[PDB]
Amino acid sequence: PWNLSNDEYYYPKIIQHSIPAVELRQPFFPTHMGPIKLRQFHRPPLKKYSFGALSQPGPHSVQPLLKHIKKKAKMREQERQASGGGEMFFMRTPQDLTGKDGDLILAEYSEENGPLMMQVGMATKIKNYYKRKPGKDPGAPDCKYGETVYCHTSPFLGSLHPGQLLQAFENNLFRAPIYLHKMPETDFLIIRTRQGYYIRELVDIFVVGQQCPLFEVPGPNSKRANTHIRDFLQVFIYRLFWKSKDRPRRIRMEDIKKAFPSHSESSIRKRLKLCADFKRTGMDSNWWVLKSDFRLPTEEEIRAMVSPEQCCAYYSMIAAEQRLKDAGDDEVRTAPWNTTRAFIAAMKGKCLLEVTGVADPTGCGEGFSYVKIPNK
Amino acid sequence: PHELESQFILRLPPEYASTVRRAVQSGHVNLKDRLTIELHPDGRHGIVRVDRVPLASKLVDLPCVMESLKTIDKKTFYKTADICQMLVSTEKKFIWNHGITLPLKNVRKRRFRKTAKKDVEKEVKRLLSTDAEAVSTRWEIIAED
Amino acid sequence: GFESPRPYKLTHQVVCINNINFQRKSVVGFVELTIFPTVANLNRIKLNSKQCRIYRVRINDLEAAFIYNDPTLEVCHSESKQRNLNYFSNAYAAAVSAVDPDAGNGELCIKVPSELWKHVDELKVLKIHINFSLDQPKGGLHFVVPSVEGSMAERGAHVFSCGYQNSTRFWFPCVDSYSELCTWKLEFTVDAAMVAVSNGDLVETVYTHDMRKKTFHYMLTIPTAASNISLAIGPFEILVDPYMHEVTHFCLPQLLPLLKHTTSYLHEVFEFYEEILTCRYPYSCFKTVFIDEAYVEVAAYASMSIFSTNLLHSAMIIDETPLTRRCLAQSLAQQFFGCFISRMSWSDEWVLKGISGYIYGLWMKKTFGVNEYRHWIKEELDKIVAYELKTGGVLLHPIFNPASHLHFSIKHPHTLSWEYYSMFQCKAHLVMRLIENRISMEFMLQVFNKLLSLASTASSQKFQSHMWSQMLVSTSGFLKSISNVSGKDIQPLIKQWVDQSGVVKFYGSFAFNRKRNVLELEIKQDYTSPGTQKYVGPLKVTVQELDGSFNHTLQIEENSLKHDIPCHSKSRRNKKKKIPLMNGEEVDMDLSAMDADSPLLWIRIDPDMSVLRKVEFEQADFMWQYQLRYERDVVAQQESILALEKFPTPASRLALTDILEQEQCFYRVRMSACFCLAKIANSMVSTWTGPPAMKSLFTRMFCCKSCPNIVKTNNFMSFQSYFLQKTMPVAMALLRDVHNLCPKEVLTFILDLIKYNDNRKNKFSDNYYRAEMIDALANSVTPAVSVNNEVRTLDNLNPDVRLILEEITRFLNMEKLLPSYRHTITVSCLRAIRVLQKNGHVPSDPALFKSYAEYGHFVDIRIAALEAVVDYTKVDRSYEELQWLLNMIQNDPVPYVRHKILNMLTKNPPFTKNMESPLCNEALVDQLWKLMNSGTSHDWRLRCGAVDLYFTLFGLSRPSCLP
């Protein structure tokens, strides 16, 4: 007639990326980054086109896109109201991730090179942490973006004041305090493609403070690194087998050698040894056909193999490897594998961090340094 | 294949910025004829032509890194591109010291730790290339002379 | 997209019933349908009608000609000498498909008059006025007329519509499909002292000009199918719900306080189902009718539910409150997702049954706790795997035979066996739990809200189906709505667990590699059994080592056998630290039984029941004891209890005794540990040291501190030590002596529990505890030592059994003067007399049970007595008792009793196909073939039960014992 389940003795007490991001599609998640592409990591230069309308030299008209924005927003609202009116998932194609539609905000970073950084196509949430005032409080100061949550226990290193609302980017990679600023009155946003220039205005720009890392960047040739390297190659090989139209699913080796050119071919052959065999003569010659007993994994199994956040941690590791390599122990402490290990260990309560040090990304007294120091 | 889109910021003089803003928020293709952008083969020089009036432009490097973040519900935000360049209209000259927001000004001089930026290694490559034009080299740790 | 199989579209139907005669069991009425032809040259219109005598039919007030033929009255010809069951199953499927309204067909074929052909070619409305009469219906609408004198309201006579699925053709002519939605107008002219309850809202109630009868007018503006239309006419006591005011509860006279107490919880069920879904209750009223001699225990129609009165309990009745509570809850779940959103075909029934069962399981989770939810899910999964390994498999969503491994056709609901229908609903709600496991619960509730919101925007239009078919769900529409809200499609999961009809069997064994510190699992599947299929997906395994609980995902492809997973340290055996559990807590474990070289404490293959599986894991006995003691999952404690019966070591006795002593264990685990401890105690005789098992524990928990053999006076206010107290002597009576006789220390203990029982002080009744005491007395009976087939008389009775017989005589006679709540002690004493007759103690005479199986008794007494007669005619090979049972199947007033007799005679058959018996005549084959063919033609559940009985007795081929 009651509960009668002794639950207090048995049980004592989210981010959805785009379908191009969870499927690790090449443009957005690169297979190989060279040295000049690792120096320009997250700072991609303005490339000159060889073919297209902008490849011909001369003046080029920019095109306003406000009929396009409101047409796409009205179309997405029709899709949402036709599907029952709830919240929907829209980012299903690469053409959904254009800047030509939707409400864009900008997000500036305080640090030069953060320990973790999102790739194109990945999602993040805005959480407004609001500590109530002692006793009576009016309610969270309302904010245009994000959802509000009442935080008794401060997520960040410091603690919130009573009656202080702090917005923050929250995802699987990090959690970082953001601060809404209005845009300058002179700056517009030009989206250039091969066909032409397009212009939006911006009105909202956030400044992102020092990140609190939630994912540990691996070290060079570590356990996570070892796994990710061969897992990423295996996922790429499976997706090339899925893309093959020939009934005996067959791929070519120099497609994989074009994608991963730093790999020795012994490793690529090791990945192809199980699940494929080389045909030298007859039909399918110089192809790696799929074995007939091998069941090619489904889409959800391939998604469960490698996560996009592991790819971001690997990209952070190899970019920091390049920067350290170019600059000939203080710098090694500022490497993201050390700082991410230090911060995550401090969050479990293993150890403490010297908050003033050399891992400080500001170079002055502002900002923290995530390097391990004793509890006692 | 897919090529990552390349977004940059365009800064205009304030009267020309007001005319461009009014024409953008209007939304007609009349703006397309009015606003053009010609980038010179220097790579760091241009003309922006507002209403067929030429303005001189420089593509500069920004000290911080910005990221465009799109949303559909204003609760989850997806990163679309990285912005690091600005075509201000009116080398060391092509580096901007200030940031776009008001709190970030002279960021490069004051709020940036001076570990280093970059140049020295391209010169090293050139030096190694010249070195291979040698059979005998003479080098001496030197003093004031 | 829904395209009708009928060439017309039905818009509105008027059902008027006059002259409900209770003495003659007769109704008169008419039916007026408003159809729009969709194809020109409609000519014949085919409607559904059974048992109704059609007097006249007028189309647009012009006299029309009809022809009636029902091929399902006599399925095969009388002069065909076929006697195999595959012939009858194909002929019965063809006969049901020939009256199917889901095809274009129907039983009543009306011919459109000639002058209306220019009205039908350019597609204009047709109004068909049939007037009919039910003369004395067999299973159409049930007349319960008691034989007390007085007026029909003074004796308590009532009518209700009984049947399952499309059975509204049995009391008025209609289009009896779930896809023909129309609006309704229902008038019933009943006696002035009676009330007529039906679907819709009651717009008025006018008197007749003599003021001796009154007409109830109902209107249903939400477009429902004909199959969801019901009726209950009787002298009901009306009770408006004091919390929700559109909900009226109707009971039989003199049962108003029981109705007040019983239906006082229902507003919380309404609040739950309207806050997990975000739609309000779609109908404008809700009516709960409690009746006598019900068809099923709970039936749900549009805006109405019909329960039996045997669910009504008072405030002092426990062990019946959760069962009635969950019957109300599943009736409301079917109100949301069986009556508002309806089916598009007979396929896509798994969608509706799965959503109903799944949201009812969510209600059970919130109400009775997650632990009761896990126990319920595990018992349903064990039920399905037992049924699918027993016979073939249940196929949700077949494609039209698709399932030829069984003996009936799955094309229509009225050819299904009743056990298949039950397992169909069970598998549907477990597959919906699997879809929730792949796509999270909030997205699942968003799917259900989107379906309900499309249906409720559809439910307010007036266009005749231009939008009323958005109230019908299909499989493709359900999967498309899932793909709309989530972006993932479930087509591999749908292809494996819906379209394929099998469960999986896992055999696991591990080995710990000490050198490389790995755990080598070995999981092999039995995929060559008749009910099984091969699993190739991922598989979760949870390993509890000394460093904590870790989950691992294994990829089990066809050629896979050995899975090497890594193991952690053993540094919590170096220092005594607490070992962290599956939840956040940590406990002190006694690590003396653990191996020195392995850190792992237990392994669980598929802990979350994420596949439809049967696991056979080979752990060591100390791992099963650690999993019984320190696990924070009730299904793992239950499976460790189930696996400790093979290890009768005293450490397992200590483990189960520590589970029994432990409050803050879930009570249904301790109730299982009682029976496990009884089995282990029986297996380690000539080793057992002290007293019998659980006796000292019973005297420690439930008896006085100063008197060990006097039980404490009954205070049943804890509800967990009440259940444990009433289940512990029942398991304690299964103790056996080395001589295979129950010890006289446990029998004396049970008799002292019976004598010193005092219930004058608790606020709850004692009927279930005393009934379990009779069950414990029946468990102690060992077979008697008859010498030379000596006649069992009173003098050569066992000295043990004379005390038992005196106690059950006292209990049954005291029940004759002071009755229990549902005659629970009568049922227990009849069961115990059958236990004493099954051994050689009481003479094997069925006359007592034949007197308790008469019509005027309570239905629980009737089914207990008929179970005893079925067991007697199995053991004594009685011909006249089998003819008695078959006669009672043919002509009994209560159809639930007929279905139960066929069910019990299928479960405990008098002979199987392998047996040579004296009861395998050509006469019995002819009787059972006549019972399948004719005789059971009026119920659709007796005919499937007769098909099941013929399959159990004679098999799928020609009866062998025949010329």
UniProtKB/Swiss-Prot annotation, chain A:
Q: Where is this region: Histone acetyltransferase (HAT)?
A: 1-376
Q: How is it modified after translation?
A: Phosphorylated by casein kinase II in vitro.
- Domain of life of the organism encoding this protein: Eukaryota
Query: What remark about domains does the record contain?
Result: The Bromo domain mediates interaction with histones that have acetylated lysine residues at specific positions. The second domain also recognizes and binds histones that are butyrylated and crotonylated.
**Similarity comment text for this entry:** Belongs to the TAF1 family.
Look up the record and name the associated disease.
Dystonia 3, torsion, X-linked: An X-linked dystonia-parkinsonism disorder. Dystonia is defined by the presence of sustained involuntary muscle contractions, often leading to abnormal postures. DYT3 is characterized by severe progressive torsion dystonia followed by parkinsonism. It has a well-defined pathology of extensive neuronal loss and mosaic gliosis in the striatum (caudate nucleus and putamen) which appears to resemble that in Huntington disease.
Protein name, as recorded? Transcription initiation factor TFIID subunit 1
State the species of origin.
Answer: Homo sapiens
**Shown residues in whole-protein numbering:** 585 to 992 of 1893
Curated annotation (Swiss-Prot), chain B:
Cellular localization per UniProt: Nucleus
The PTM Phosphoserine maps to 129
What is the tissue localization of expression for this protein? Ubiquitous.
Q: How is it modified after translation?
A: Phosphorylated by CIITA. Ubiquitinated by TRIM26; leading to proteasomal degradation.
Share what the entry says about its subunit structure, partners included. Answer: Component of the TFIID basal transcription factor complex, composed of TATA-box-binding protein TBP, and a number of TBP-associated factors (TAFs), including TAF1, TAF2, TAF3, TAF4, TAF5, TAF6, TAF7, TAF8, TAF9, TAF10, TAF11, TAF12 and TAF13. Part of a TFIID-containing RNA polymerase II pre-initiation complex that is composed of TBP and at least GTF2A1, GTF2A2, GTF2E1, GTF2E2, GTF2F1, GTF2H2, GTF2H3, GTF2H4, GTF2H5, GTF2B, TCEA1, ERCC2, ERCC3, TAF1, TAF2, TAF3, TAF4, TAF5, TAF6, TAF7, TAF8, TAF9, TAF10, TAF11, TAF12 and TAF13. Interacts with TAF1; the interaction is direct.
Family statement drawn from the similarity comment of this UniProt entry? Belongs to the TAF7 family.
Additional remark text: Overexpression of TAF7 in HeLa cells inhibits cyclin D1 and cyclin A gene transcription and causes the cells to accumulate in early S phase. In contrast, depletion of TAF7 from TFIID complexes by siRNAs increases histone H3 acetylation at both cyclin promoters and stimulates cyclins CCND1 and CCNA gene transcription.
Q: What does this protein do?
A: The TFIID basal transcription factor complex plays a major role in the initiation of RNA polymerase II (Pol II)-dependent transcription. TFIID recognizes and binds promoters with or without a TATA box via its subunit TBP, a TATA-box-binding protein, and promotes assembly of the pre-initiation complex (PIC). The TFIID complex consists of TBP and TBP-associated factors (TAFs), including TAF1, TAF2, TAF3, TAF4, TAF5, TAF6, TAF7, TAF8, TAF9, TAF10, TAF11, TAF12 and TAF13. TAF7 forms a promoter DNA binding subcomplex of TFIID, together with TAF1 and TAF2.
| Protein name (Swiss-Prot/TrEMBL) | Transcription initiation factor TFIID subunit 7
**Organism listed in the record:** Homo sapiens
UniProtKB/Swiss-Prot annotation, chain C:
Tell me the compartments it is located in: Nucleus
One GO cellular component term, please give it.
Answer: transcription factor TFIID complex
Q: What is its main location?
A: nucleus
A molecular function (GO) term: chromatin binding
> Example GO biological process term?
transcription initiation at RNA polymerase II promoter
Its tissue distribution reads:
Expressed in all tissues tested.
Which UniProt key words apply to this protein?
Disease variant, Intellectual disability, Nucleus, Phosphoprotein, Transcription, Transcription regulation
* Outcome reported for the amino acid change (mutating residue 398 to H): In NEDFCF; uncertain significance
At the top level, the lineage of the source is Eukaryota
- Implicated disorder: Neurodevelopmental disorder with feeding difficulties, thin corpus callosum, and foot deformity: An autosomal recessive disorder characterized by impaired intellectual development, microcephaly, delayed psychomotor development, pyramidal signs, thin corpus callosum, and foot deformity.
Misc remark for this entry?
PubMed:9418870 was unable to show an association between TAF2 and TFIID.
Family from the record: Belongs to the TAF2 family.
Self-association and partners: Component of the TFIID basal transcription factor complex, composed of TATA-box-binding protein TBP, and a number of TBP-associated factors (TAFs), including TAF1, TAF2, TAF3, TAF4, TAF5, TAF6, TAF7, TAF8, TAF9, TAF10, TAF11, TAF12 and TAF13. Interacts with TAF2C1. Component of the TFTC-HAT complex.
The task this protein performs is described as: The TFIID basal transcription factor complex plays a major role in the initiation of RNA polymerase II (Pol II)-dependent transcription. TFIID recognizes and binds promoters with or without a TATA box via its subunit TBP, a TATA-box-binding protein, and promotes assembly of the pre-initiation complex (PIC). The TFIID complex consists of TBP and TBP-associated factors (TAFs), including TAF1, TAF2, TAF3, TAF4, TAF5, TAF6, TAF7, TAF8, TAF9, TAF10, TAF11, TAF12 and TAF13. TAF2 forms a promoter DNA binding subcomplex of TFIID, together with TAF7 and TAF1.
Q: Per its record, how is this protein called by name?
A: Transcription initiation factor TFIID subunit 2
Q: Name its species.
A: Homo sapiens
Q: What is the lineage of its organism?
A: Eukaryota, Metazoa, Chordata, Craniata, Vertebrata
Q: Please tell me where this chain falls within the complete protein, as first and last residue plus total length.
A: 19 to 988 of 1199
